[PDB]
Amino acid sequence: MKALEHEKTPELAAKLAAEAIERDPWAAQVSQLSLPKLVEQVALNAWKEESDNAVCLHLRSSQRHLNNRGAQQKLAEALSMLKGSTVELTIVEDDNPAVRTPLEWRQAIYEEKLAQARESIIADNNIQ
Known part of the structure; x- marks a missing residue:
């Protein structure tokens, strides 16, 4: 009609x-x-x-630029409903990659299939 093309495989994702x-x-x-x-x-x-x-x-x-207090407060009430008590919910802005976000985790799970096929050679070991 108009185009859509943005669902693609929402099932796979x-x-x-x-x-x-x-x-x-x-x-x-x-x-x-x-x-x-x-x-x-x-x-x-x-x-x-x-x-x-x-x-x-x-x-x-x-x-x-996504991080706004309007989001944080709604997130806080939700996290507090989850925890069943007051969560001191804060958003800090730290771009360092030492931990994976749940977005980056979704992506990383996919690439783990690909990476495991190269990491198998790491498991064949050399120094560890």
Whole structure:
């Protein structure tokens, strides 16, 4: 009609997300919270650090423009509904790759199939 072409394989991407959730407690938590779109993109562009009484979403500063307090407050109420108590939910902007976000995890699960086929040679070992 108009074009669509943007679904492509939403099944493959959601199946891939199932594995991400089956590995990542944060991806699982977000899917249980069932976030909308903007706030979902905030939760997606961040990896969830968790402290004694807080949850600090390390958002890739590469998408710092998604992070707004309007999202954080809605995210906070949702995280608090999950935790069943007040979560000190903050969004911090840390672009360092040392942890994978649930978005990057979905992507990384897919590439693990490809990477395992090269990492098998790492497992053939040399020094470890």
